[model samples]
Target: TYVLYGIKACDTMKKARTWLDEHKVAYDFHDYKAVGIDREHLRRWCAEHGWQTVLNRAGTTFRKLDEAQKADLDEAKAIELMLAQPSMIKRPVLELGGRTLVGFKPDAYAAALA
Candidate 1:
């Protein structure tokens, strides 16, 4: 089964969901805003993709952080930030057949699901 992790209201999340629906790909969504993500799962994703890839430094959530919070980041620090505010993590983290894909790209989704 496919599992997608992201906030329900996010624009990127909406686009990703639409793409999946249009392509007839079935998935279960895990909304971070409502349900909240766990540290263990975050750690696992970080291990697979690396903390830099998993963290969404481009997002407003990260930008809104205090200077001290954003400074001198490492794996543990990044994970801590993401755990505290899941929105700081990247959107549309799709788990497909045990492989995790962070962020959405039409071609990447097509290739992965194919």
Candidate 2:
């Protein structure tokens, strides 16, 4: 089963869910705040997908982080930050089938389904 990890209020998460519903993809949605994300969990994900593919800087949650946080943001730091504040992580991290995808793109999701 696929796990969609993201906050409920995020547009990207909503969009990802919309696509899944439209295409009839079965997924279990996990909210970061409710579930609490930690470094070990993120480390496994990063090992597979890497920080670049999974990290997002576009969200308001990310933008709201202090400049020092943003400035010092590196792969290690990012993992720590996301682990501490899962809200700081990217939206709609899809985990399934020994594969992980971070964030959503319509074409990418289409390919994933394929």
Candidate 3:
């Protein structure tokens, strides 16, 4: 079992949870306020994964970022930015076992779960 992280009003998070239900994947839910994210976790993910994969460049949250915030971001810088503004993260960050998937990808999720 794992936890899903997202704001309640987020459309993409809603979609991701719905798909998980459709696929019979069970998970707990966590609100950002109740369970705030930390830099260590983001740092670990980006080190093994890659900043591009973890960073949500597609979201309006990213686009709305201040110039200083959007400046060239390495792994350390990414963690700092993400911790400060979590909404810049893609929706439905699925934390399962020891792996963390930052967005909803049904097929990718299935593969990871398997």
Candidate 4:
């Protein structure tokens, strides 16, 4: 089974969900905003994938952060902020079997499925 972690309102999540649907890949969606996220899970993810990999520096939520919030984005800072604001994390984190992907890329998804 696969789990997709992201809010439904995110365009990226929509695209990823559509792609999965088109490909007949059934998955469980963990809507962070509506359902809330676990801090322990975020910490575990940061440990496994590196907070740099999971952080969304390009998104509006991340970009809108204050200068102080953005500076010194070390592992601890990233983890702290992401847990504080779930939207600060990257979109469409796909967990398939034992594999975990941070963002959506068609080729990457396809290859992973293949």
Which residue pairs clash in candidate 4? none
- lDDT against true structure, model 2: 0.79
Taking all chains together, each candidate's TM-score versus the true structure is 0.93, 0.82, 0.82, 0.88
lDDT of 1: 0.91
Q: Give the TM-score of candidate 4.
A: 0.88
Give lDDT: candidate 1, residue 44. Answer: 91
Q: List the residue pairs that clash in candidate 1.
A: none
Per-residue lDDT of 77-111 in model 3, one digit per residue for the tens? 87887898887766777888887887787787778
Where does the lowest 10-residue lDDT sum fall in candidate 1?
25-34
Runs off by more than 4 Å, candidate 3: none
lDDT of 4 by residue, 1-114 (tens): 889999988788889888889999988989887787877878877877899888888878898989998897788889889888998888878888776888899999998875
Flag the better candidate by TM-score, 3 or 4. Answer: 4
Candidates' lDDT values, in order?
0.91, 0.79, 0.79, 0.85
Error (Å) of candidate 2 at residue 40 is 2.4
- Pairing residues by index, what is the TM-score of model 3? 0.82
Best by TM-score: 1
Looking at candidate 4, the ten consecutive residues that score lowest on lDDT are: 36-45
Q: Which tens-of-lDDT digit does each residue in 3-76 have in candidate 1?
A: 99998788989998999999899899898867999899899999999999999998888989998998999989
